[PDB]
Structure formats: structure tokens, C-alpha cells
Design a protein around this ligand. Structure first.
Ligand SMILES: C[C@H](CC(=O)O)C(=O)C(=O)O
Ligand SMILES: [Mn+2]
Length: 429
């Protein structure tokens, strides 16, 4: 039902459908030459020009070629330069241009295309919504906010506009205000609203204002395929890995590493305390997004399988100990770090990025009351010289309500069901 042919193109239809059928057949290189061999013969036609670009676009996905695709992006532009081009075709070509610009990371180039589209079609709500995304992708939340406010003033129940507006409010620290927008947008069911990122932000906003319905939305997100379960919501996952929030050492099979950590725990503690005492600047403030209140810092020895040489000069015996255990030093999706937390601290519920690791905590200095960690529905506490093991792809939350500082040692390990070849080939995050 789209109209892609001006007065001209209608005359040469039998040819245009030929070059088109070649592409639908998958015989791409000929559609290209076919189309390419029609502008020299049919320079003025939009639909012929559009066809050449569609071919380049397809050749690009086939050949995995950015260079090819850059060619398509210009030919899509050429379509819009010709006379009496039909609105439906103008819109198709520039929209695809913007999308492929965005694919290459030409985010401001895409924004300029989308600005053009809105000038051409000042009443197409869909295109304003896309323009707002263009402003978000260059980091310009203020202009995106104005775009969606415009959309909502004309079409107040557009769910796409609502979920993006809620996201923008949340990023501006209007957390409570974002929630009804996210909810209503998701509930509209409109195209582009059934997106795990809006379930993520809705659930996070609700948890951060004490609303217990967050878990209803995580569960809905799960049923919609955005989360592994109501509790396990990491983004970068491998299928088939045992999924439980708390593990015993025997269950992980890394019993020799647990033994080494527990049996040498005072040395690990003492090296951490020495760095605290002498080089306290080496403890870096933890994730400010996750820290509701308090004072929480970390001193990293390994990051994604890469040893920090300057840090291992501060904790040399501990680094030496760990070098025996590639299940953690070679965990490209994990970290090895000391983690200190002072009284009055609360870490918001969150998950880690991957189900490919397990997270070990060795207790080094644990006040006798006040410190606890929840993973999923079970809350536990640390002990000096003992390891706890949890799957941090499950939601977890930490409180420090003691009267002195709490020091732990955090050791990530590859999930034990990952094969050697999987461990070798997984990208770091
Ligand atoms: C809050 C905790 C760390 C800590 O308790 O120092 C956490 O999120 C984690 O181990 O992943
Ligand atoms: Mn965490």
C-alpha cells in the first residue's frame, strides 16, 4: 500500500520490478548493476534511484561491509534530490538513511537527516518521535524533552513518546514523575514500547521510591522475554548455565580457590589495610548510581582478566596467591577488588551485567552487627575469613548500619559450567 512511483516511474515499471525481483531472489550483484544501469538510462526517476540504494543496502549486510553501506547512505540522499518525488518514497528513503547512519555511529549525521524529515513532514508524529531518539543518541536530552512534549501536546496517549519522556524525566532525577509515563507507555502496547530498557527503568524507579510493585513489572518483563526471571536480569548471558542466587564452594567446584582465600585471609586483609593506611587514594568511590547514601570505595587488582600492575605492587602477596587460579584472574567478565563500606551506607538493589560469572566475597573486617547482603529472597551476612558466593546476575542489595568500617575481598570466577572454549571466546564487557 505505499506509493513509490511519480508520473515518470510508472512508465518503466516492467523494468523496475525486474531489478527488484532479482534482489528478492537474492541475486544481489545483478539487481545492483540492473539498478545502477538505470540512472544512466533513467536519471530522473525516484523509484529507480531508491532501488539502487536498496541493493547497496542489501549488499552491505551480505558482505558485512561498512564501505558498501556508506554508498547506500548517499544514494538514499540522491532519491530525495530529484523532482516530484512521492511523499511515501521521500519518507522511506531518508528514514532508512537515518537508520543506517545510526548503524555506523554517524549520530549527528542521523540527527541532521531526521531534522530534515520533520521539516518536510511537520504533521508526522512518528518522525518527531524518531527525531527525539536522534537527540537522545547525541546526548541532547533537553531537545529530546522538548520534542516529546510537542508530541504529547498533540497526541497525549502516544506510548512511544510517553516511555521516552519517562526515561528523560528519570535521567533528570525526576524519578517519581517518570513512573506513570513509563507505565502508561508500556501499557499502551504501542510499537517501540515493548523494550526491556523501559522495564529496567520503570522497575528501578519504583524500587528507588519504595514502591513494591516493581517486581510485578520485572515479572511482566520476564514473561515478555526481557529478563531471565523476576530476579535474574543481567543483559549479557549464555544459555544453559545453572541459575541460583547463592552457591556453596562445593557447588562451584572452585574449592581450592576458596581454601586459599580463607586460609590466607589475614594476609589478604593486611595488604588491603596497608593500602588503606598509606595509599588511601587508591580506593576509588564506587558506582555513584548504586550508592543511595554513605561511603563506599574499591581498590581493584584485576579488571576483566587484566592485572593492574601498580595495584599488585600494593598487595603483592595477594596477587601472587591469586595467580594460581586462572578461573578468576582470567575471568574476562569479572573483577578482583577490595571493597570497603562505612556506616550509614545503602546500595540500591541491582544486578551485574552477565550470568557468566559468580561473585565470591571474602570477609576481612566485619563488624559484629549491622552489615548484610541480600541476593534474591535470602539475606546473609559476612564472616571474617569466610567466603560467601552469590550469582550477581540476581538482584542483590547491601546495607551497612554498623558502628565501624566493613572490608571485604571480591573475587569473580567464570561460571563453572562454561566450557574452556566458551571461556576463551566470550567477549569482555
Ligand atoms: C554492594 C556489593 C559490594 C560490597 O558489599 O562491597 C555489590 O553490589 C557487589 O558485590 O556486587
Ligand atoms: Mn553488585
Amino acid at each position: 500500500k505505499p506509493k513509490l512511483l511519480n508520473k515518470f516511474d510508472k512508465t518503466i515499471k516492467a523494468e523496475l520490478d525486474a531489478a527488484e525481483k532479482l534482489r528478492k531472489r537474492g541475486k544481489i550483484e545483478e539487481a545492483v548493476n540492473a539498478f545502477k544501469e538505470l540512472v544512466r538510462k533513467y536519471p530522473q526517476s525516484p523509484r529507480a534511484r531508491y532501488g539502487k540504494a536498496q541493493c547497496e543496502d542489501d549488499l552491505a549486510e551480505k558482505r558485512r561491509s561498512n564501505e558498501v553501506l556508506r554508498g547506500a547512505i548517499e544514494t538514499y540522499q540522491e532519491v530525495a534530490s530529484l523532482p516530484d518525488v512521492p511523499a511515501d518514497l521521500l519518507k522511506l528513503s531518508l528514514k532508512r538513511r537515518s537508520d543506517r547512519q545510526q548503524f555506523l555511529g554517524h549520530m549527528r549525521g542521523s540527527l541532521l537527516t531526521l531534522q530534515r524529515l520533520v521539516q518536510l513532514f511537520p504533521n508526522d508524529t512518528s518522525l518527531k518521535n524518531d527525531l527525539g531518539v536522534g537527540y537522545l543518541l547525541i546526548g541532547d536530552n533537553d531537545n529530546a524533552k522538548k520534542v516529546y512534549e510537542e508530541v504529547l501536546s498533540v497526541t497525549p496517549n502516544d506510548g512511544f513518546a510517553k516511555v521516552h519522556y519517562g526515561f528523560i524525566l528519570k535521567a533528570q532525577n525526576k524519578i517519581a514523575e517518570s513512573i506513570p509515563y513509563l507505565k502508561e507507555g508500556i501499557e499502551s502496547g504501542d510499537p517501540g514500547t515493548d523494550d526491556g530498557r523501559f522495564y529496567f527503568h520503570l522497575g528501578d524507579a519504583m524500587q528507588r521510591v519504595g514502591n513494591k510493585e516493581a517486581y510485578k513489572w520485572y515479572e511482566l518483563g520476564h514473561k515478555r522475554g526481557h529478563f531471565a526471571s523476576v530476579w535474574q536480569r543481567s543483559l549479557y548471558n549464555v544459555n544453559g548455565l545453572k541459575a541460583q542466587p547463592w552457591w556453596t564452594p562445593k557447588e562451584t567446584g572452585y574449592t581450592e580457590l576458596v581454601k586459599s582465600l580463607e586460609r590466607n585471609w589475614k594476609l589478604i586483609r593486611d595488604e588491603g589495610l596497608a593500602v588503606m593506611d598509606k595509599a588511601k587514594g587508591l580506593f576509588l568511590p564506587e558506582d555513584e548510581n548504586l550508592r543511595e547514601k554513605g561511603d563506599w570505595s574499591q581498590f581493584t587488582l584485576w579488571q576483566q582478566g587484566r592485572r593492574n600492575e601498580n595495584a599488585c605492587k600494593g598487595a603483592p602477596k595477594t596477587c601472587t596467591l591469586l595467580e594460581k587460579f586462572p578461573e578468576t584472574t582470567g575471568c574476562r567478565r569479572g573483577q578482583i577488588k577490595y571493597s570497603i563500606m562505612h556506616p550509614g551506607t545503602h546500595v540500591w538493589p541491582h544486578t551485574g551485567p552477565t550470568n557468566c560469572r559468580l561473585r565470591m566475597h571474602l570477609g576481612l573486617v566485619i563488624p559484629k552487627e549491622g552489615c548484610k547482603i541480600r541476593c534474591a529472597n535470602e539475606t546473609k551476612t559476612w564472616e571474617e575469613g569466610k567466603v560467601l558466593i552469590f550469582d550477581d546476575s540476581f538482584e542483590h542489595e547491601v546495607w551497612q548500619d554498623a558502628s565501624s568500617f566493613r572490608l571485604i575481598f571480591i573475587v569473580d570466577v567464570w561460571h563453572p559450567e562454561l566450557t574452556p572454549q566458551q571461556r576463551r571466546s566470550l567477549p569482555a564487557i
